[PDB]
Each structure stands twice: as C-alpha cells, then as structure tokens.
C-alpha cells in the first residue's frame with residue numbers, strides 16, 4: 001500500500017507476486033521461488049514386517 | 052524478425068535474452084541439473100570365486 005499511495009518507489013522484502021497485487025503495482029522478475037507449502041511434524045516410522 | 056509473434060516453449064529467462072525480447076512470468080520454476088547414466092551392477096558366474 002505504500003507503493004500504491006506513491007509513498008515510495010519500491011517495496012523490497014518478502015512480497016509474493018500474485019494477480020491481485022500485480023494489477024495495482026509493477027512486480028520485477030522473481031528473484032526467488034516461493035509458494036504455498038504445509039509444515040507438519042514427522043510421523044512415527046513403522047518397520048514393515050518381512051524386512 | 053517477425054516470423055513468430057510469440058514463443059510458447061521452454062525458454063529460460065536470461066539476462067542477455069531479456070535485453071531484446073520481453074518475457075513473462077514463468078510457468079515452471081527450475082534450474083540446471085546433470086543427467087548421468089545409472090550404474091548397472093553387472094554380475095558374472097564366478098563372482099563367488
């Protein structure tokens with residue numbers, strides 16, 4: 001919102017490119033790939049019989 | 052040269068390329084890797100000797 005209201009020129013940070021923002025602000029090329037991922041704790045490993 | 056108006060192909064976004072043509076947002080985010088031949092374990096008949 002501080003680039004929309006001309007309060008600054010660029011917004012360097014963890015901004016993700018998406019269609020909603022790119023219609024109101026110009027995004028540079030992605031300098032790192034991100035997205036949506038799910039983080040969970042590891043499950044209890046079970047040793048299969050007949051090993 | 053005007054022969055094609057678009058390049059729908061795996062065109063990586065390069066610095067030298069982007070100077071002359073205008074790219075888009077990527078479809079596939081990927082890098083470069085090395086493809087080798089899997090080491091097939093060959094066995095003879097006297098391997099126990």
Ligand SMILES: N[C@@H](CCC(=O)O)C(=O)O
Nearest residue numbers: 013014015016017035036
């Ligand atoms: N990096 C996101 C916020 C964090 C999230 O993915 O929820 C953004 O710039 O909007």
